[PDB]
């Protein structure tokens, strides 16, 4: 009486919804671009290969400064390098070893970690002692944590596998705001430059875009068959770009409200690990398990490059604020820093 | 190179001297997984064996450091943090014999047994333990000869002789598992069935643990 | 907060042998590179020794070279000089200052709170302009620092370092490689220059603002503070 009237009104609404995005799809982004310039050839080399880690690379995170990037690993060890003169600044001893992802404050200060142990520990680096200590042991989650970005050094919003996402307050260690849109594991997060909006995409094939002001899920964007493992944002913050394991990264459109493009090729059918934008946004970085990365064109959907010196798969790329370098670790234990040549 | 560039490095230096020695120490402790129902005895091991998210215990029974995890809190889908533990040595797997009759809490259509032999598939036949022997523990073998006894097995099976005794019918359980192993010559099963005596399980995981490291050694030895 | 307390001193013939004892508490020692810096009465800081974390890299002055020796301890938190044939030139007030190094530390933020050293009886040469002004408190004071080296390196930054010292206290950080500022000092200090002709410029001075600025020289060892400029109110 209520079960299947709700039902057929639900996917009423999907169906109305999709006829709405078809009829303002009367160009794609194949055909805008077909008169500009094609990019050519990236050929980045390995300028940097930062070594010290002795098990898997989870995550990477850069920082404003476009210097300094922490790395998370297997090993129980979360390091802060200097990508410049390669050494280590820091190596904090984890609580956890199995620490799925890690960012860098946007003023420096601290860093936040999270795994399996299901809790986002935020380290104080800029600290009137010698070692990193623990602020806050934020606690709550249900599932594994994949994501820990950051808004400022006050907020940070966390994903994880408990199909919600979370909008933390550091000091008093408590969620303020809980994103609970998903029915599948979140595995991405992407914080938009104005830090008012962000896409996370779960295993549920679908990637939403909350607001961390209101709290609801502004829009939600399908078409994948497969789990979205890792969502960046063009530099705009109009569209993001996800990754799935059917090889294929697709633009969504915040505006359009669908996809642009398909980055998909015929003999890549492994998963898409991480995927990351240039400054400009013509070059988009995606992270394969195949053990290298594709330098995908945005614009034309042309693998411009392949950085292919990593033996075993890349997991988390991400590039410089200013765009300089891109640095991707690996699970072979190494952080090479790629960077294009004149 | 300046004075701030030089100490910089030095200080690198010690974080990779430390680094490298908190790395040796992680090889030489031995990480086992564990998987289980929950309340199909995996518990009861545990405390044994000592005596939300990730739990860890440590435990030496015989100059070796072994790490355990206890991952069956986590509801999430296993695909998505299944490949974290890719490189360990076992894996624990817990199963109660008086889970062949009970059936399942979330849906009852499917029996507690065939469950759990549907989590030893998934995890058996995965691409990330192809070469990780599993370690297999039957939970409730004091429960288990009472048990069957009352009711007898062939409610959880069609295809049964039926000799309803404990002797034969544990033998078929072990066989039924080994059975859904698919890989025979990279990995193997070691079966064991719980006591309630502390030394004896723990001996178990010993024996086994270093039975699996001669494995591992002679493989990358080569007389394999 | 944290605790630099060094003793042992104060009455030692000519030649005799005394050590120092410097006593951690609050941080963690292990991370820190310790410094020893001497103050004469009246007169300019001088640095003495510095041992890196680790005990990897000893660095001496060269008028304390081969008399004195620099010893930590790790696990104890405790720094000790040990001083051998001490001469008339040895008086002076010795500090116990903690240092770290990497990208955006601050070195020399710390400081101990000292112990009197008396006695009975090449390099980057750090000269500043003039020795004593007298200011008044709410305008614009500009106190340089000329350096004899170029103190700009090859990486982009330069290493010069300004410590205010009120009278009857001990140093502190206040601007570390000429532009960024410690941590608990004010945004009234700023610190400008250009290759070799470096100066501090206040915005307002306060109470809290009067002693004697000094701009110590990092490139390279030995490390050579100027004769620092008094301020009276």
């Known amino acids: 009486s209520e079960l299947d009237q709700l039902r057929q009104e639900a996917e009423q609404l999907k169906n109305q919804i999709r006829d709405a995005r078809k009829a303002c799809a009367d160009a794609t982004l194949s055909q805008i671009t077909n008169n500009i310039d094609p990019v050519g050839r990236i050929q980045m080399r390995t300028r940097r290969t930062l070594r010290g880690h002795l098990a898997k690379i989870y995550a990477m995170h850069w920082g404003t400064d476009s210097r300094l990037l922490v790395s998370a690993s297997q090993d129980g060890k979360l390091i802060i390098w200097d990508s410049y003169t390669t050494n280590k600044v820091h190596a904090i001893p984890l609580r956890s070893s199995w620490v799925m992802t890690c960012a860098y404050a946007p003023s420096g200060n601290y860093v936040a970690c999270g795994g399996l142990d299901n809790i986002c520990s935020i380290y104080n680096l800029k600290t009137r002692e010698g070692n990193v200590r623990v602020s806050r042991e934020l606690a709550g989650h249900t599932g594994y944590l994949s994501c820990c970005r950051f808004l400022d050094d006050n907020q940070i919003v966390t994903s994880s596998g408990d199909t919600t996402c979370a909008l933390w307050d550091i000091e008093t260690g408590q969620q303020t705001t809980t994103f609970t849109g998903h029915t599948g594991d979140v595995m991405s997060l992407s914080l938009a430059p104005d830090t008012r909006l962000f896409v996370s995409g779960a295993c549920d094939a679908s990637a939403k875009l909350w607001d961390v002001r209101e709290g609801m899920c502004r829009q939600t964007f399908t078409g994948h068959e497969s789990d979205i493992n890792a969502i960046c944002f063009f530099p705009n913050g109009n569209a993001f770009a996800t990754g799935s394991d059917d090889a294929t990264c697709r633009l969504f459109d915040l505006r359009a409200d669908q996809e642009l493009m398909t980055y998909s090729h015929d003999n890549i059918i492994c998963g898409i690990t991480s995927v990351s934008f240039s400054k400009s946004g013509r070059l988009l970085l995606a992270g394969y398990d195949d053990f290298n990365c594709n330098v995908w064109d945005a614009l034309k959907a042309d693998r411009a490059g392949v950085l292919a010196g990593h033996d075993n798969r890349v997991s988390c790329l991400g590039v410089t604020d200013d765009g300089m370098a891109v640095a991707t670790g690996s699970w072979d234990s190494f952080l090479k820093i790629w960077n294009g040549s004149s | 190179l300046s004075a701030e560039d030089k100490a910089a490095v030095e200080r690198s230096k010690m974080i990779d001297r430390n680094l490298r020695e908190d790395g040796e120490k992680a090889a030489r402790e031995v990480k086992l997984l564990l998987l289980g129902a929950g309340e199909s005895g995996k518990n009861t091991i545990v405390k044994q064996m000592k005596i939300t998210g990730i739990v860890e215990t440590h435990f030496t029974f015989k100059d070796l450091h072994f790490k355990m995890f206890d991952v069956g809190a986590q509801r999430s889908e296993r695909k998505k943090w299944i490949h974290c533990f890719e490189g360990v040595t076992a894996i624990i797997f817990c199963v109660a014999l008086s889970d062949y009759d009970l059936v399942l809490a979330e849906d009852e259509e499917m029996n507690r047994m065939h469950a759990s032999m549907k989590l030893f598939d998934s995890i058996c036949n995965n691409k990330w333990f192809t070469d990780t022997s599993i370690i297999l523990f039957l939970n409730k073998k004091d429960l288990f000869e009472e048990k069957i006894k009352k009711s007898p097995l062939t409610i959880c099976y069609p295809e049964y002789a039926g000799s309803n005794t404990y002797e034969e019918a544990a033998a078929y359980i072990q066989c039924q598992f080994e059975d859904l192993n698919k890989r025979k010559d990279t990995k193997e099963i070691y079966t064991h069935f719980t006591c309630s005596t502390d030394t004896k399980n723990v001996q178990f995981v010993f024996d086994a643990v270093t039975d699996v490291i001669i494995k591992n050694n002679l493989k990358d030895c080569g007389l394999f | 907060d944290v605790q630099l307390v060094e003793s042992g001193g104060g009455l030692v013939q000519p030649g005799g042998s005394r050590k120092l004892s410097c006593s951690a508490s609050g941080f963690a020692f292990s991370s820190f590179g310790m410094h020893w810096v001497r103050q004469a009465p009246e007169k300019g800081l001088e640095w003495v020794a510095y041992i890196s974390s680790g005990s990897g890299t000893i660095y001496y002055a060269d008028t304390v070279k081969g008399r004195f020796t620099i010893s930590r301890d790790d696990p104890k938190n405790t720094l000790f000089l040990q001083m051998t044939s001490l001469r008339s030139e040895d008086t002076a007030m010795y500090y116990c200052?903690?240092?770290?190094?990497?990208?955006?530390?601050?070195?020399?933020?710390?400081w101990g709170q000292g112990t009197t050293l008396t006695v009975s009886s090449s390099d980057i040469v750090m000269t500043q302009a003039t020795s004593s002004v007298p200011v008044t408190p709410g305008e614009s004071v500009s106190i340089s620092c000329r350096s004899s080296?170029?103190?700009?390196?090859?990486?982009?930054?330069?290493?010069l370092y300004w410590f205010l010292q009120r009278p009857g206290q001990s140093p502190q950080l206040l601007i570390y490689?000429?532009?960024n500022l410690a941590s608990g000092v004010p945004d009234r200090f700023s610190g400008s220059g250009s290759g070799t002709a470096f100066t501090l410029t206040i915005s307002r001075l306060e109470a809290e603002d009067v002693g004697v600025y000094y701009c110590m020289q990092h490139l390279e060892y030995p490390l050579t503070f100027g004769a620092g400029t008094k301020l009276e109110l």
């Open positions: 490689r000429m532009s």
């Open positions: 080296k170029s103190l700009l390196h090859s990486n982009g930054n330069t290493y």
């Open positions: 200052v903690r240092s770290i190094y990497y990208y955006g530390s601050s070195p020399f933020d710390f």
